[PDB]
Design a protein around this ligand. Structure first.
Ligand SMILES: *[C@@H]1O[C@H](CO)[C@@H](O[C@@H]2O[C@H](CO)[C@@H](O)[C@H](O)[C@H]2NC(C)=O)[C@H](O)[C@H]1NC(C)=O
Lengths: 247, 596
């Protein structure tokens, strides 16, 4: 959808692979502001908001925190405290039309600058002088929205660029989306350390014949000392023995 | 809100919708000049009125603004282009009569018909032929007859037509609040803004000759040398006290003396600098020449050209029915569309022409960031001068040896230096007096200083003092001889050519000083000197956003137009001519004539 009617998408309760988005040559511009793109796979928030639209080639710089311009003030706004990333890429091969893809429209006139994370789709005629515009356009009457004359041959400056702005919110609600886990393989009969499903400890792992009920995850014998764990992948009962020591 | 905000909003609405229409019209024009077909013709009509149906309508929305209080210079100057009365202030009958007379005068001038009396069934036009015959011939009778015939079939019947054209254009001049059309013509070199840079239109009139008196002695020595060479070739046709006629200059106008260079060659023993045979040996096609010239442009300091030009732009050999008129042109179609149009071939002349056209392209790049109404240079001569700068610079042996055009063991001497300098002066300084007198004659005929009768005799008698041309045949009142010229039948300002040479010479001299080069000025090269390119582009980016007086402040330190670089360039030629034609006295007589 157009920049003044930017598509808003909410992402929650899933796992996000930011590495593949980073490792994609189809995106010309990829600028992050919260954390480094590689570290993004590690930390996480409670939900993600995507603002996707198409603009001119020269207006990508306008979409940035602390930036001003026609798009940056009249179609969409990014606050200074913005957390997340912006991903832009040329779309002249697809969005631009030989006959003119005039469907894309951008706001040019508005009384007030748009607030952050706010959308304006008003098509009311704008007045710049003193005489009010009573309907039909007159002297001081210019339409707030102007179409895009996208053509395959328009120079790099005017090519249609698709822009998606990703914001991350971590409200008091429990987190719903996080990155990958990249679990390793399993070894036996060796003194090693482990972090099974967030439970860390040292020792040696052997096979056990204990019969967990179908809902426990780990079992301890007495004095609160873990003895057996269930592997999250194979779902079998293991046994933990402390590594040998003496005098 | 104040009216200034309304004007700004009007301009912001106007330029966005003007860009698309201008791009479409320019694309259609480029396609037709690249694809000569019937369909692209009506499109011009289909665009033409349409463009008017936009622009004039936008002009219709550009009168109610009181354009005298906008503090912002850029906005007011941009709106000034839209606040032009034009020919609409004239009555409809007057406008249609002006259109009809312009059309008929242009058609008559472009349809010249000269039939030799022995074979009246075959006339000739400005197309190759008679043009070539008078451009390259060694005779006194055929050239004179061709000149007389052309002046008879273009100037005899154009006296009332030229009179009415001039008087109606001047009536339009008063209708546009101008007491003379010369003011409208000179308004290009005019500014009334920033203090210390304002220039009056009438000041250019005196500046034209104030920069011309210094080349008068050098022009006199060149005239004496040419006269001596004519006496060597032509026997007893030009008296030493007198001067050569118009038809012996190689053209019926005597605009350029390059046609007469063969007769007046300084030293034909040493060949000129030409590597076209080496160009064929090196196998430099259009693509290789274009790439090498673009590399030279980058080494100068100009940015590399954007992608997409190498495909859309035609380069060489239209070939089949898919024809293309390939007059050298640089197209700024708008919306970041820059293209070239030329029959580029394996030729040194084509090499320089390609350099000129891509210099025009680079200057189009320079003012691309300016708004639609400001997508032009400070003055019309700046574009041509900038396009000619690097073309002139690339002719030096240093650039040729840098890319191995000339032989690696090439050595230059004073003989070929003098030959090349005189050859260049026969075209550069050999046309300045003619342009000067033509522009002054146009100014005075538009001002109405001379009465109806005293038009042709005054022109011919003043050509004797200014150009140095005698009359082999008389033209008192039944001829209009300057009317048989390209820039007389299309309402063309002729000051641009006079200013272009001075501007390009000033820029070349300034870059030569700020380019770490030593020796003669004619050998100065700006290749692999990024500082010179940056200095040039600093002024290039200005465009129409800055006055021409302010524009002449980055490359050169003087805002005014000066002649010193012109004489600095032809210093060896002046020294050689001081002792060359010592026996032949300098000067000519305006009383001697071939008839009496
Ligand atoms: C996680 O995914 C793997 C791979 O699909 C599952 O491993 C499969 O387990 C079944 C159960 O016996 C075998 O029949 C398949 O051959 C295994 N596929 C392999 C090893 O590629 C594993 O069970 C899954 N973990 C779960 C469901 O908790």
């Amino acid at each position: 959808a157009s920049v003044y009617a930017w598509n808003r998408k909410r992402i929650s309760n899933c796992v996000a692979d930011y590495s593949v988005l980073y490792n994609s040559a189809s995106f010309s511009t990829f600028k992050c502001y919260g954390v480094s793109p590689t570290k993004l796979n590690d930390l996480c928030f409670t939900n993600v908001y995507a603002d996707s639209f198409v603009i001119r080639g020269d207006e990508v710089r306008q979409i940035a925190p602390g930036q001003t311009g026609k798009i940056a003030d009249y179609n969409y706004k990014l606050p200074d405290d913005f957390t997340g990333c912006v991903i832009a890429w040329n779309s002249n091969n697809l969005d631009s039309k030989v006959g003119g893809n005039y469907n894309y429209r951008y706001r040019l006139f508005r009384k007030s600058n748009l607030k952050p994370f706010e959308r304006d789709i008003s098509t009311e005629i704008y007045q710049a002088g003193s005489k009010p515009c009573n309907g039909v356009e007159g002297f001081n009457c210019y339409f707030p929205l102007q179409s895009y004359g996208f053509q395959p041959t328009n120079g790099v400056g005017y090519q249609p660029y698709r822009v998606v702005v990703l914001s991350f919110e971590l409200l008091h609600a429990p987190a719903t989306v996080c990155g990958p886990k990249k679990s390793t393989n399993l070894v036996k009969n060796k003194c090693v350390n482990f972090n099974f499903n967030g439970l860390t400890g040292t020792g040696v792992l052997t096979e056990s014949n204990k019969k967990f009920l179908p809902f426990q995850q780990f079992g301890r014998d007495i004095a609160d000392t873990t003895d057996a764990v269930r592997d999250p992948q194979t779902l079998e009962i293991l046994d933990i023995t402390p590594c040998s020591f003496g005098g | 809100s104040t009216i200034e905000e309304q004007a700004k909003t009007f301009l912001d609405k106007f330029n966005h919708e003007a860009e698309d229409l201008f791009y479409q019209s320019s694309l259609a024009s480029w396609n037709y000049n690249t694809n000569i077909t019937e369909e692209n013709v009506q499109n011009m009509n289909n665009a033409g009125d349409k463009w008017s149906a936009f622009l004039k309508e936008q002009s219709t929305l550009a009168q109610m603004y009181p354009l005298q209080e906008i503090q912002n210079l850029t906005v007011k100057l941009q709106l000034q282009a839209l606040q032009q009365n034009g020919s609409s202030v004239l009555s409809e009958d007057k406008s249609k009569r002006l259109n009809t007379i312009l059309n008929t005068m242009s058609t008559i001038y472009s349809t010249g018909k000269v039939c030799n009396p022995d074979n009246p069934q075959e006339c000739l036009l400005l197309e190759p032929g008679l043009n070539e015959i008078m451009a390259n011939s060694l005779d006194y009778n055929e050239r004179l007859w061709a000149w007389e015939s052309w002046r008879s079939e273009v100037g005899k019947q154009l006296r009332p037509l030229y009179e009415e054209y001039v008087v109606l254009k001047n009536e339009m001049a008063r209708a546009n609040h101008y007491e003379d059309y010369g003011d409208y013509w000179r308004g290009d070199y005019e500014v009334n803004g920033v203090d210390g840079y304002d220039y009056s239109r009438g000041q250019l009139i005196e500046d034209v000759e104030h920069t011309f008196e210094e080349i008068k002695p050098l022009y006199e020595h060149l005239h004496a040398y040419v006269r001596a060479k004519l006496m060597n070739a032509y026997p007893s046709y030009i008296s030493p006290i007198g001067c050569l006629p118009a038809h012996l200059l190689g053209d019926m106008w005597g605009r350029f003396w390059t046609n007469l260079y063969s007769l007046t060659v300084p030293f034909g023993q040493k060949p000129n600098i030409d590597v076209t045979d080496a160009m064929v040996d090196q196998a430099w096609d259009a693509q290789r020449i274009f790439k090498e010239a673009e590399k030279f442009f980058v080494s100068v300091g100009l940015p590399n050209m954007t992608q997409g030009f190498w495909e859309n732009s035609m380069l060489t050999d239209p070939g089949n029915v898919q024809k293309a008129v390939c007059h050298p042109t640089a197209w700024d179609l708008g919306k970041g569309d820059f293209r070239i149009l030329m029959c580029t071939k394996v030729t040194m002349d084509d090499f320089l022409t390609a350099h000129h056209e891509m210099g025009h392209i680079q200057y189009d790049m320079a003012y691309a960031a300016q708004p639609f109404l400001l997508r032009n240079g400070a003055n019309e001569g700046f574009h041509e001068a900038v396009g000619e700068i690097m073309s002139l610079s690339a002719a030096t042996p240093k650039h040729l040896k840098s890319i191995g055009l000339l032989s690696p063991d090439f050595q230059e001497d004073n003989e070929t230096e003098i030959n090349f300098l005189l050859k260049q002066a026969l075209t550069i300084v050999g046309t300045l007096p003619f342009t000067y007198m033509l522009e002054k004659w146009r100014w005075m005929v538009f001002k109405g200083e001379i009465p109806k009768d005293q038009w042709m005799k005054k022109w011919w008698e003043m050509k004797r003092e200014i150009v140095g041309v005698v009359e082999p045949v008389p033209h008192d009142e039944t001829y209009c001889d300057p009317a048989s010229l390209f820039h007389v039948s299309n309402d063309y300002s002729f000051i641009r050519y006079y200013t272009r040479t001075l501007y390009q010479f000033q820029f070349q001299e300034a870059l030569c000083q700020a380019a770490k080069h030593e020796g003669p000025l004619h050998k100065c090269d700006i290749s692999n000197s990024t500082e010179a390119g940056q200095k040039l582009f600093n002024m290039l980016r200005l465009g129409k956003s800055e006055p021409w007086t302010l524009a002449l402040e980055n490359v050169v330190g003087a805002k005014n137009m000066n002649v010193r670089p012109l004489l600095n360039y032809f210093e060896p030629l002046f020294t050689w001519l001081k002792d060359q034609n010592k026996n032949s006295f300098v000067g000519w007589s305006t009383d001697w004539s071939p008839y009496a």
